[model samples]
Target: MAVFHDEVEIEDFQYDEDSETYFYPCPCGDNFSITKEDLENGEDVATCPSCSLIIKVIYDKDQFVSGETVPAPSANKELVKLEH
Candidate 1:
């Protein structure tokens, strides 16, 4: 856990509203990216596509998941139950 790149707040991430993704500059000279669907699915860790670096994302849980139209009816929640 200590080896993680950083924990970046969602506000600090650059939003690509059109792409429905958030991105942050990676030390690896690439961008760390996470999609809106990712957050909606409660997947908060963003990773660089060009490298192995990962950053934990800080975001409001209920605010995010409940704020918009979700992709699936119950798959995400079911995945949560399955994971647990």
Candidate 2:
């Protein structure tokens, strides 16, 4: 039941600062449109109003919203084993 032409990363979209909409070219001559609020609100589907086709938008909502970078954790107590 879930259908989309393909998954398109948000990075590929053209953002219009005035309208605050992310847009992509749709094959049907219309554009795939998605709103800024929709993206921030966790919407992953970009639709073309002039057609029945849709595309899956890919990106991490958490990473998209949050800009903090926390410290990573790693443990290396043992020495490198090169004999194996």
Candidate 3:
């Protein structure tokens, strides 16, 4: 996913050099890791350990910053998604 902060692009990524793998943490406190080779071959997808949620991890050029207000790209509008 692409995250914008302070008009800067921050790509969300996690890596462990010792293990030679990349990982991403989800909001539900799950750590998912995949080998570099797997990721490069378009075969790496992450599953959350806690919630059993699955997501595809890809290389995105976005920005993440601290104490920065990131405004929505669109104007004031309330939107919500409900799952039954």
Model 1 clash pairs are none
TM-score of 2: 0.66
Residue 83 local lDDT, model 1: 18
Give lDDT per model, in order.
Answer: 0.76, 0.73, 0.50
Global fold similarity of model 3 (TM-score): 0.49
Quickly count the clashes in candidate 2.
Answer: 0
lDDT of 1 by residue, 1-84 (tens): 577878889977876747878888776677788998898787888877789778889987766867555544433211112110
Pick the winner on lDDT between candidates 1 and 3.
Answer: 1
Q: Where does model 1 exceed 4 Å of error?
A: 1-3, 67-84
Superposed by TM-score, candidate 2 places the C-alpha of residue 36 at a distance from the truth, in angstroms, of 1.3
| Model 1: per-residue Cα lDDT at residue 32 | 84
- Count of clashes, each model: 0, 0, 4
In angstroms, the error of model 2 at 22 is 0.4
Task: Please give the lDDT score at residue 37 for candidate 2.
Answer: 75
Score candidate 1 by lDDT: 0.76
Q: Which parts of model 3 have CA positions greater than 4 angstroms off?
A: 1-10, 60-84
Compared with the true structure, what per-residue lDDT tens digits does model 2 show for residues 1-84?
466688888877776667878777776787888887787678878877788677888866875565576435465333323231
